[PDB]
Structure formats: C-alpha cells, structure tokens
Design an enzyme around this catalytic site. Structure first.
Site, PDB file in Angstrom:
ATOM      1  N   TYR A  59       0.825  -1.160   0.026  1.00  0.00           N
ATOM      2  CA  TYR A  59       0.182   0.023   0.036  1.00  0.00           C
ATOM      3  C   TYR A  59       0.975   1.305  -0.125  1.00  0.00           C
ATOM      4  O   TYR A  59       1.785   1.310   0.803  1.00  0.00           O
ATOM      5  CB  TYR A  59      -0.753  -0.082   1.234  1.00  0.00           C
ATOM      6  CG  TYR A  59      -2.146   0.915   1.537  1.00  0.00           C
ATOM      7  CD1 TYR A  59      -3.122   0.383   0.635  1.00  0.00           C
ATOM      8  CD2 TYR A  59      -2.094   1.969   2.110  1.00  0.00           C
ATOM      9  CE1 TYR A  59      -4.534   1.191   0.703  1.00  0.00           C
ATOM     10  CE2 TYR A  59      -3.209   2.786   2.035  1.00  0.00           C
ATOM     11  CZ  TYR A  59      -4.609   2.136   1.579  1.00  0.00           C
ATOM     12  OH  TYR A  59      -5.630   2.913   1.511  1.00  0.00           O
ATOM     13  N   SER A 132       3.898  -7.049   1.674  1.00  0.00           N
ATOM     14  CA  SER A 132       2.618  -6.578   2.349  1.00  0.00           C
ATOM     15  C   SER A 132       1.491  -6.911   1.755  1.00  0.00           C
ATOM     16  O   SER A 132       1.221  -8.071   1.429  1.00  0.00           O
ATOM     17  CB  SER A 132       2.891  -5.004   2.883  1.00  0.00           C
ATOM     18  OG  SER A 132       2.152  -4.922   4.128  1.00  0.00           O
ATOM     19  N   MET A 133       0.545  -5.862   1.405  1.00  0.00           N
ATOM     20  CA  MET A 133      -0.613  -6.191   0.540  1.00  0.00           C
ATOM     21  C   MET A 133      -0.196  -6.799  -0.330  1.00  0.00           C
ATOM     22  O   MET A 133      -1.040  -7.634  -0.917  1.00  0.00           O
ATOM     23  CB  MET A 133      -1.037  -4.658   0.279  1.00  0.00           C
ATOM     24  CG  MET A 133      -2.631  -4.496   0.654  1.00  0.00           C
ATOM     25  SD  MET A 133      -3.100  -2.871   0.429  1.00  0.00           S
ATOM     26  CE  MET A 133      -4.333  -2.654   1.942  1.00  0.00           C
ATOM     27  N   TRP A 157       0.360  -9.705   4.329  1.00  0.00           N
ATOM     28  CA  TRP A 157      -0.830  -9.258   5.060  1.00  0.00           C
ATOM     29  C   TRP A 157      -1.965  -9.354   4.140  1.00  0.00           C
ATOM     30  O   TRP A 157      -2.132  -9.000   2.729  1.00  0.00           O
ATOM     31  CB  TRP A 157      -0.900  -7.809   5.577  1.00  0.00           C
ATOM     32  CG  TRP A 157      -2.191  -7.447   6.242  1.00  0.00           C
ATOM     33  CD1 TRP A 157      -2.267  -7.718   7.682  1.00  0.00           C
ATOM     34  CD2 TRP A 157      -3.165  -7.057   5.753  1.00  0.00           C
ATOM     35  NE1 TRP A 157      -3.628  -7.377   7.867  1.00  0.00           N
ATOM     36  CE2 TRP A 157      -4.242  -6.960   7.060  1.00  0.00           C
ATOM     37  CE3 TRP A 157      -3.707  -6.633   4.515  1.00  0.00           C
ATOM     38  CZ2 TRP A 157      -5.480  -6.307   6.450  1.00  0.00           C
ATOM     39  CZ3 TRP A 157      -5.029  -6.131   4.102  1.00  0.00           C
ATOM     40  CH2 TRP A 157      -5.930  -5.943   5.279  1.00  0.00           C
ATOM     41  N   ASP A 178       8.100  -6.102  13.033  1.00  0.00           N
ATOM     42  CA  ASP A 178       7.159  -5.177  12.152  1.00  0.00           C
ATOM     43  C   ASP A 178       5.717  -4.858  13.003  1.00  0.00           C
ATOM     44  O   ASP A 178       5.238  -5.534  13.684  1.00  0.00           O
ATOM     45  CB  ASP A 178       6.693  -6.430  11.036  1.00  0.00           C
ATOM     46  CG  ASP A 178       6.004  -5.715   9.927  1.00  0.00           C
ATOM     47  OD1 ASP A 178       5.286  -4.851  10.013  1.00  0.00           O
ATOM     48  OD2 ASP A 178       6.146  -6.339   8.691  1.00  0.00           O
ATOM     49  N   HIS A 209       9.224  -3.180   9.100  1.00  0.00           N
ATOM     50  CA  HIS A 209       8.409  -3.830   8.012  1.00  0.00           C
ATOM     51  C   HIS A 209       8.860  -3.767   6.856  1.00  0.00           C
ATOM     52  O   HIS A 209       8.628  -4.782   5.997  1.00  0.00           O
ATOM     53  CB  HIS A 209       7.075  -2.706   7.922  1.00  0.00           C
ATOM     54  CG  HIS A 209       6.055  -3.298   7.292  1.00  0.00           C
ATOM     55  ND1 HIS A 209       5.306  -4.418   7.026  1.00  0.00           N
ATOM     56  CD2 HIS A 209       5.476  -2.396   6.179  1.00  0.00           C
ATOM     57  CE1 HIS A 209       4.580  -4.725   6.266  1.00  0.00           C
ATOM     58  NE2 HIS A 209       4.261  -3.119   5.643  1.00  0.00           N
TER      59      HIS A 209
HETATM   60 CL   LIG Z   1       7.732  -1.388  11.368  1.00  0.00          CL
END
Ligand SMILES: [Cl-]
Ligand code: NA
Length: 265
Positions: A59, A132-133, A157, A178, A209
């Site tokens: 994102y 991530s996304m 995620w 994260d 992250h």
């Molecule tokens: Cl983080």
C-alpha cells in the site's frame, strides 16, 4: 537431465553475491495490460527458456520498493516483472488480479517478435512475490492458480489469514519488529494455515516492516533464500534443495520454520 536447470552449480557465495551468473537487461512495459506500470528484467545469456515471476508492492508503494529483486532474480535465470498497481491504494484482491495480469502480459510478450523476451519464457513455470498487501496478493494468486510453481511473499498481510487451500510451495519472509503487519497477527497465522504445501518461514532479526525491500541490509541472505526457493520449485532444480530447505546458521534470522520441503526416499 533436468530440462529446466540453468547456470553453474550453486554455492553459498554465489547465491549471496549481489549478482548471479547471467547478464541482465530490462525494459519498461510500453502498454501495461491490467495494471499500472511494469518493468521486465531478463537474462540475456541464460541458455534456455526460463520461468517468470511477477512482484507487487504494498500500500502506497511503487516499483522502487521491490526493484532490487528484479536484477537479483533475473541474474540467476528468471524473467521478472515488477509492477505499479492501478492505484497505490489497491487492496490485496486487486493486487492479485494485477499480478496475474502482469504474468499474462509476460506470456504475451514471449510471443511478440518485437519484444526482448520473445521466446525467452517458459510460460508454464511462473512464480509470485510481493510486499505486505502485495504479499497477501501473492498468496491469493497462489490460492486461485495452483499451477503457479512457487510463491515468496514478504511481510504479507491480508484481511483473512486463512490460506489453507494453497498448494504452491510458499516461502514467507517476515520482519521480527514489524509494527504494520505484526508477525503474530499476520505472517505467522498465514504460515500456520497452510497444511498442504512445501512451505518456509524466515523472520529477519530486528527487522522493521521494510526489512526485505529495496535498500535492506540483508540482501545476501534474503536474496540467497529467494533465489534458492525459486530455483528449487520453479525449475525443480534439486541442486538448490539444501539452500532452499536449510535453516540458515545466521544471527540475522530470529525465527525459522519449514515443512514438506526436503525430499524423503
Ligand atoms: Cl515497522
Ligand atoms: Na496503465
């Protein structure tokens, strides 16, 4: 005997190096089909056709966050497409669709005589990666397309951590500290949900992250593991079995898990 085996026999040093054995070139996709923008990285001297990998950012993010994987993987014998999404604010399901559209376009370009990757791709051997996304999107892609040969998302995620249907060999990179997608609520529940596949969990000690993104300080280990995973499962290349399945003897790993990776007679 392996028709998909490319390149010299690997060593830890050769896989930790910034660059593999093949020379890499790249081009930006001139009319992206179903996603925002793309860069294709490809080996110029791999000696046979190679599989393709599509990589999606997270994102707000763009290709620059995942760009280091392009030359790193292509230099070991893969065609790699890094994308921008139609909107930086797209969700994982849309990221998955766009990732698969990018693989589709790599297949198109493999059949396009003006393209630098004309005839370079084995379109039957594909892989998915992301952040991530975009990592959740990679797992959605694997769930919906079980003929994909490997997945290696990073700090994944999704709003649903249950990926129990995934049968694709899946390596999950995670970052210990994260705070965006905490390991205990995201990457680890995702990993624990998959009981049908070869899988691996590699958590970077102290990582924020972005611990697997461009500019990370663990490119030797992360790149070795990503390449070894893709080599072992996209190419069926058992020269890479030890590197793919081993627990790294490294203080740069705070949590390692793997299942169904090693071959048993
Ligand atoms: Cl983080
Ligand atoms: Na576009």
């Amino acid at each position: 005997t392996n028709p998909y085996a490319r390149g010299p026999n690997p060593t830890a040093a050769s896989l930790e190096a910034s660059a593999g054995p093949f020379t890499v070139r790249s081009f930006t996709v001139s009319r992206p089909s179903g996603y925002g923008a793309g860069t294709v990285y490809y080996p110029t001297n791999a000696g046979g056709t190679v599989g393709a990998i599509a990589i999606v950012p997270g994102y707000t993010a763009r290709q620059s966050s995942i760009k280091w994987w392009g030359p790193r993987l292509a230099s070991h014998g893969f065609v790699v497409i890094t994308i921008d999404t139609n909107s930086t604010l797209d969700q994982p399901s849309s990221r998955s669709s766009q990732q698969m559209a990018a693989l589709r376009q790599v297949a198109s370009l493999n059949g396009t005589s003006s393209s630098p990757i004309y005839g370079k791709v084995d379109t039957a051997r594909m892989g998915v990666m992301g952040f991530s996304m975009g990592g959740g999107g990679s797992l959605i892609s694997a769930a919906n397309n079980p003929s994909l040969k490997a997945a290696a998302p990073q700090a994944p995620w999704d709003s649903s951590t249950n990926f129990s249907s995934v049968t694709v060999p899946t390596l999950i990179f995670a970052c210990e500290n994260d705070s965006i997608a905490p390991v205990n609520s995201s990457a680890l529940p995702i990993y624990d949900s998959m009981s049908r596949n070869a899988k691996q969990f590699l958590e970077i000690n102290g990582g924020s992250h972005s611990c697997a993104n461009s500019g990370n300080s663990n490119q030797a280990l992360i790149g070795k593991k990503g390449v070894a995973w893709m080599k072992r499962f996209m190419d069926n290349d058992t020269r890479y079995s030890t590197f793919a399945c081993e627990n790294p003897n490294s203080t740069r790993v705070s949590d390692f898990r793997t299942a169904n990776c090693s071959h048993h007679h």
